[PDB]
Amino acid sequence: KQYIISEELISEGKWVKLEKTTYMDPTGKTRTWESVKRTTRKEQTADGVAVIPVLQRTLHYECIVLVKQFRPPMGGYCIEFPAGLIDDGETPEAAALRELEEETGYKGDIAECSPAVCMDPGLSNCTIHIVTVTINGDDAENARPKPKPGDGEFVEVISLPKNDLLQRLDALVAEEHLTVDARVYSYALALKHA
Amino acid sequence: KQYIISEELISEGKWVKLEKTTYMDPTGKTRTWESVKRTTRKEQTADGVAVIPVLQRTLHYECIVLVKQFRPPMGGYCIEFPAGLIDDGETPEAAALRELEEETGYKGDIAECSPAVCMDPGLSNCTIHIVTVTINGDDAENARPKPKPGDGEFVEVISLPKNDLLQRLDALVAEEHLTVDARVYSYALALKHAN
Numbered sequence: 001k002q003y004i005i006s007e008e009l010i011s012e013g014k015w016v017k018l019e020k021t022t023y024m025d026p027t028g029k030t031r032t033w034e035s036v037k038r039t040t041r042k043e044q045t046a047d048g049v050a051v052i053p054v055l056q057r058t059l060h061y062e063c064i065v066l067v068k069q070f071r072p073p074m075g076g077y078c079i080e081f082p083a084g085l086i087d088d089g090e091t092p093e094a095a096a097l098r099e100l101e102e103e104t105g106y107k108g109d110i111a112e113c114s115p116a117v118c119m120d121p122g123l124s125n126c127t128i129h130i131v132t133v134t135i136n137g138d139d140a141e142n143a144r145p146k147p148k149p150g151d152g153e154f155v156e157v158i159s160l161p162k163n164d165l166l167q168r169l170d171a172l173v174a175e176e177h178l179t180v181d182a183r184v185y186s187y188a189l190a191l192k193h194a
Numbered sequence: 195k196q197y198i199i200s201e202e203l204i205s206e207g208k209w210v211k212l213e214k215t216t217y218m219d220p221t222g223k224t225r226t227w228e229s230v231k232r233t234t235r236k237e238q239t240a241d242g243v244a245v246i247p248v249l250q251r252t253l254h255y256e257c258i259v260l261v262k263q264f265r266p267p268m269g270g271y272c273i274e275f276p277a278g279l280i281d282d283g284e285t286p287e288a289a290a291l292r293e294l295e296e297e298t299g300y301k302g303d304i305a306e307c308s309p310a311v312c313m314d315p316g317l318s319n320c321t322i323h324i325v326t327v328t329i330n331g332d333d334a335e336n337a338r339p340k341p342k343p344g345d346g347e348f349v350e351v352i353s354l355p356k357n358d359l360l361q362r363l364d365a366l367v368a369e370e371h372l373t374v375d376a377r378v379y380s381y382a383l384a385l386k387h388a389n
């Protein structure tokens with residue numbers, strides 16, 4: 001019923017552009033929208049990956065491995081699933097295992113890979129694959145994991161028990177000025193609601 | 195240890211602006227970022243709310259109520275939690291019950307309310323409150339739900355059983371060429387991962 005008529009570039013930076021979107025509404029009336037897109041999206045099924053990294057260890061509760069980083073858009077520290085953009089020609093699964101190792105030091109095993117899902121579809125066309133990865137924390141490879149951050153990457157690893165994730169996030173938010181990512185919080189809420 | 199030095203306006207629309215953010219990296223090196231902000235936020239706790247609506251009917255599976263809408267930035271239809279921007283002087287809780295009624299016609303009760311959570315913090319400063327709302331589907335006011343959508347809103351309601359949410363969302367994507375919202379998919383995943 002509804003479809004795009006035109007996409008007019010307003011402003012294009014190195015990383016992000018703003019567009020004037022013209023579309024047909026279901027009454028048959030022309031309307032416009034302000035649309036954000038990234039400049040980095042090539043022939044990928046999505047902009048990026050976020051990794052749901054389930055750290056498994058004999059005689060430990062499963063942990064969810066999270067990262068804390070300064071996010072210039074937010075003007076502050078954010079707690080998020082390990083995540084990055086998919087390199088040209090890179091599979092979502094390879095991107096997920098690569099970003100997880102670079103940001104946390106852990107070497108994961110793929111469990112599942114979502115279709116492309118939308119980050120903020122009233123604002124942007126940005127998409128990710130959410131890749132579930134298990135980490136064998138009994139493997140020597142995953143003993144003393146050292147992050148290998150790229151240039152301008154400054155990442156702290158926070159591993160929280162799956163069985164108490166929402167309360168543990170709440171206790172981190174109570175103790176410091178930091179924002180939890182909406183996907184992490186949605187995931188922690190569902191663990192509670194299950 | 196890191197902080198904003200300055201923000202340079204690049205482009206300001208009616209709804210969205212693009213800024214060049216200058217920040218101090220942990221080493222003392224000065225760095226720039228391209229940052230998106232909405233123009234609509236004021237004294238608000240957050241830009242918006244997203245409602246997790248648990249529809250509870252006796253002798254029925256518990257359902258999560260979702261909405262399907264054309265999303266101009268996506269150039270397509272998306273499946274999402276009911277959601278909208280918070281009105282100036284509106285509480286996140288009141289925004290949640292209002293948006294849920296306008297988008298779905300259901301009248302629900304606040305179960306819990308998240309702190310402000312970020313939407314895409316590598317790109318934008320956009321935040322929402324995630325508001326868990328229960329709907330007593332057996333009440334008369336939720337018998338024939340009357341959606342009251344504002345100007346230029348066109349919303350299909352899709353109720354999916356909570357206990358099979360992820361498999362049900364995967365099926366919609368396979369038949370219907372839709373995009374599932376990342377928060378919806380994250381919730382559905384954790385329902386399967388809990389056990």
Ligand SMILES: Nc1nccc(C(F)(F)F)n1
Pocket residue numbers: 032033034035122123209210279
């Ligand atoms: N980004 C954007 N563009 C046009 C209209 C809107 C509004 F839904 F919030 F009104 N947002």
Ligand SMILES: Nc1nccc(C(F)(F)F)n1
Pocket residue numbers: 015016085226227228229316317
């Ligand atoms: N929005 C934005 N600004 C600067 C650099 C980036 C990058 F992560 F994609 F590299 N993004």
Ligand SMILES: [Cl-]
Pocket residue numbers: 193248305326328
């Ligand atoms: Cl609930």
Ligand SMILES: [Mg+2]
Pocket residue numbers: 082083084099103
């Ligand atoms: Mg990253």
Ligand SMILES: [Mg+2]
Pocket residue numbers: 083084099102103153
């Ligand atoms: Mg990275």
Ligand SMILES: [Mg+2]
Pocket residue numbers: 277278279293296297347
């Ligand atoms: Mg609305």
Ligand SMILES: [Mg+2]
Pocket residue numbers: 276277278297
């Ligand atoms: Mg809405």
